[PDB]
């Protein structure tokens, strides 16, 4: 009786709501399919206050919470979303990651992810403000936890058979200037509570 | 020995913590590094690690110094003067320095890994001013409480 | 001591002496990676040189 | 023709740039920013710092490497002691011998 | 473009899809609103491939696969809904559950009179078909444990002051009853036959 | 700019030019030595081998 939407829609845009993201160095077919019809997953995602972000320089799309009238507490106050909000050390992490990020992304131009790191690099960085609990087992067990944490929000691959992950790229949007801006300010406004 | 290695793995971190500075040009940290290695050497504990070293250069000597231990522990009056362990660790005393010496090349290298990482910033434009961001952000990290877990 | 005995229980070779020493009898502490980190900081350095 | 030959030179700044009039105030910024950096005149120190701490991991490694040699040394002479404890032949031990 | 969707009706759908159902007795202008809207609703479920059933004398709509069955799989595969297979225990009290919430549908009508009891008469009854884990306490415990995940699979309320509970009218709507009702035979066998 | 430019992407046939247009001659005359000699030449041979 009713019209069925493009099954091949369909399929991409749930697909992509299960993932979350959706990269066309992965999947480029769906990639493309949204590509074609991205005002179609617009008017999808309207009912669920939805939206859709797109990078093709990074071959990369991500749902993002409507700002329209999602409840100014935050975006992450909307039901249907389940994953918790992001932390504070696990913020440190990500700023770190980005920082990876964009100095390989230099190196090898603003292509796709082969943005690969060896754990063992991160434990320096990390030990500087965490601290060290002596036990470098210790520390792995931490630093592994984090990164599971956020392979939990997408951003990371967990560590392969070469203990090296690839940062999705996601974390750029996550991690462009406007939220580094803001919650630099907000970090600032935390220290000056404290002090 | 064991403070010597206290000391550079302390020098090691505050390079590093220091390295996270925006203000440090490129010039500034090289010049951090090799400010802080002069001064970690000129110290007594760096006299000793220096003074270590420059016998390797001489190996003759400390090789003979080892053979020597070898024969005196092999004297029967050598069980009486030392308990088992005792005897074992001096036989091994010239070893048990040289691989602690390692630990010290350790954390040299383990600045001068992290320095260069660095020091490779040549960054695009949007980069550079993200990496300005980041660099604020950080600095601002070094100062909160990363023990309470709450936090 | 086990890995001793594996390795003997397996001398289906029954070769010479020095094969004996150096795969059945020592335990095995060659500086490979050792000599890895000594050059790839070399070239860490001259990396900064540069 | 400066502006020109500065930026054959470069790796990641003067490239965005031109080789014209226009492009004079990026030029001199970085000119500038090296002479804070003040890079060039860690040469000397540098250099022979790289020595020394090169000069102590390849001599250190050739020490960790002899001293693995007499520890070896040490379990040969444990066992040829061992063996001593019994005959190999009629009037005959067995001893080991290195070289 | 497009205008919103009525706020109203995205707030219901948002409830729906947290909870995959909605109550009249209990939120009533939800239900209200899909009623009104029920084309809109399903509208909005036709791109990702869902559809909502409903029940009005037991007062409540829950979300369903819109796909048909085997069409181009052995079985159903949809990304959004992971099916979750039940262990044994949770799998027990459901058909407890089941042939309760149709006995008491015999006693007081279907859906007019949710179906309730004390917790008191199931433990005994569920530790025979169990084992003891340790002591009442732990059977308490489990059964508790049992029951806040049922609570939130949507099948039933907390346990009150006097331990008494409403059975959620989706247990009514569930997939496979025959195959609960032949695990409960399963499980009668067993305890017969075992003295 | 051009003139630099050849002679930066040159390979020891234009640097030893100045950069101003009495060594425009040199240029062109490097141009037509590649354009007739070096050209068929070198293209015949690599598909030859």
Known sequence: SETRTLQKIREATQELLKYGLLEEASKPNLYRIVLSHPEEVTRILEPLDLDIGIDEIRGLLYVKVRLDETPAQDEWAHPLVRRQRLNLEQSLLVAILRQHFVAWEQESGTGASQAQIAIDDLLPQLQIYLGDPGSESKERTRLLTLLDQLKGHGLVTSPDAHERIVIRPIIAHLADPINLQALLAWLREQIAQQT | ?151 | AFTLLNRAAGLKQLNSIDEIFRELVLDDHSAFDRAAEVANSFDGLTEIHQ | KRMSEAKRVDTGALVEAGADLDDIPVYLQRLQELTEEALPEKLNRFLDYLNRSSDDGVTQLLSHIEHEVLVIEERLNELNETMFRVDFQPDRYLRLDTK
């Open chain 2, 1 to 151: 020995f064991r403070r010597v290695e206290d000391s550079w793995r302390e020098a090691d971190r505050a390079l590093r913590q220091s390295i996270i500075g925006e203000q440090y040009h490129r010039g500034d940290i090289v010049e951090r590094l090799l400010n802080d290695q002069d001064a970690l050497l000129n110290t007594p504990e760096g006299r000793v690690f220096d003074s270590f070293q420059q016998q390797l250069r001489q190996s003759s000597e400390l090789k003979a110094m080892s053979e020597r231990l070898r024969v005196i522990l092999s004297h029967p009056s050598a069980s009486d003067a030392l308990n088992r362990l005792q005897r074992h660790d001096l036989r091994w005393l010239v070893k048990r320095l040289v691989d602690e010496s390692q630990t010290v090349l350790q954390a040299r290298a383990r600045s001068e890994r992290d320095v260069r990482g660095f020091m490779k910033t040549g960054l695009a434009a949007e980069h550079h001013r993200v990496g300005h961001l980041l660099n604020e952000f950080l600095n601002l990290a070094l100062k909160l409480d990363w023990q309470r877990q709450m936090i």
